[PDB]
Amino acid sequence: MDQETVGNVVLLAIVTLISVVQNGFFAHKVEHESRTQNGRSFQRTGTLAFERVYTANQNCVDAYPTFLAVLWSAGLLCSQVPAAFAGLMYLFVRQKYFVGYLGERTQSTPGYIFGKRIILFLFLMSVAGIFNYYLIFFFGSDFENYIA
Amino acid sequence: MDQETVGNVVLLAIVTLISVVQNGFFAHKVEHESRTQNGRSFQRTGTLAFERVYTANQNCVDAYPTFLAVLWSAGLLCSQVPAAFAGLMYLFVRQKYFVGYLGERTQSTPGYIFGKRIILFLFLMSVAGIFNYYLIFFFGSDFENYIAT
Amino acid sequence: MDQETVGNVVLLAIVTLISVVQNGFFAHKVEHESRTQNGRSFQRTGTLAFERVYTANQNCVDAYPTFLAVLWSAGLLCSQVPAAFAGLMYLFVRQKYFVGYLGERTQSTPGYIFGKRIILFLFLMSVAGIFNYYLIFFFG
Ligand SMILES: CC(C)(C)CC(=O)c1c(CC(C)(C)C(=O)O)n(Cc2ccc(I)cc2)c2ccc(OCc3ccc4ccccc4n3)cc12
Ligand SMILES: CC(C)(C)CC(=O)c1c(CC(C)(C)C(=O)O)n(Cc2ccc(I)cc2)c2ccc(OCc3ccc4ccccc4n3)cc12
């Protein structure tokens, strides 16, 4: 990748690598519970600390794709820096969500969803440029300067 | 993103944005179930509609990646319009599947497959340009005006 | 896609197409168990052969995203080949893992963590160029 382009994406790469790392921790806190006992042959059903964890993780796993989607499409189709930061904030809400899904009873982060607004915004940033592009395509050109 | 390039991808972006929205609906019809499922937290096995819902949705979740894969690779390596439409059609089959899952509790429908030929095609388009490239790489530069004596 | 660029990604595309195919196989060996025994909703402890399969598969399904992530970012921020080969190696570990999660009466191979170093490496490749870029940005 030519140093130039690499610039207009760096942040997105960064934030992505971050989520990639955090993504591992989530998948790590799940290994622990699998370990805490019978886990020998990674059984999915140890209850409690394992069920609450696998759930919390298997919830953020279903988000990642759809998140990354907006994350990049928004940052490319328009802005980047804003998209890049929004994506960072997501990483935090994700943390707070995953964490809040710990246990100790009580309706623990019952929500399957979470980011919402964050991806909603990222989606708009994408639906933004996606449209503004269609302009620069018609009225962006046109501008016939028949300088006869 | 230079207005030019943005063009040869717009549809892909569009279709993707679509799937992204629909994707939310899927994860929303799942939130309703855990809600109506009067209880505290959120668990993998509850009730009938919830069980059926989470399954349906958690089936399309395993799809998206492998689908987005071909969607783009097909749209980049071989014509963006045909790729974009394929993915579009795919979004529809998805709807019909997700909807048909648990809505009828009938003996047609279930499965963890959904659109097969839709991604197969997308795959081919990728395996298409991917090969035709090796021609442009190898032969695409071969001309015998060098036999010119 | 201009022939030039297509070059600096073909490997990634290829390997990606592979994992996409293998990805189908995994989801296929899951179809085999489901259709025989019953289950319109596959969320409860299924027949062993089926429970083992869906778990194995629904285990690589959580990987793919985070994998593809490093696969590309590493193959882009850091040169093509190695990143590509890395991902290729991963596809193999995947196979062995998924396969090792098959059997019957065998000590099944757990730790949903599969290919720790593989993606660790790919991650570094990314964190690599990601930094080296900041240099060329300042000290160029
Ligand atoms: C990220 C890294 C730089 C490449 C290092 C890395 O190699 C990975 C690590 C770090 C750790 C402890 C294994 C290590 O390097 O020592 N863990 C555990 C960890 C420990 C502390 C912290 I804070 C965060 C994570 C990983 C866990 C998973 C992983 O990929 C594979 C993988 C497979 C399935 C996944 C499912 C859901 C979701 C993700 C899934 N991922 C790589 C690593
Ligand atoms: C899509 C949008 C334009 C960015 C708006 C948006 O921000 C989200 C919406 C729409 C919303 C909030 C305005 C609403 O519910 O009314 N819902 C609920 C909704 C309502 C109507 C319809 I038709 C479809 C979905 C969302 C649900 C989830 C979401 O992200 C996070 C998320 C987390 C996990 C996911 C797992 C699988 C799959 C996806 C996962 N997503 C964003 C939104």
Ligand SMILES: CC(C)(C)CC(=O)c1c(CC(C)(C)C(=O)O)n(Cc2ccc(I)cc2)c2ccc(OCc3ccc4ccccc4n3)cc12
């Ligand atoms: C060219 C192509 C990309 C392989 C497309 C394709 O054609 C698909 C195939 C192969 C096929 C059509 C010859 C078949 O046997 O049915 N199968 C079954 C198969 C047969 C032999 C072997 I080895 C491997 C898989 C598919 C199964 C699912 C599929 O949708 C994508 C998909 C769907 C659900 C998934 C769930 C989890 C995780 C990933 C998921 N992915 C496409 C195909």
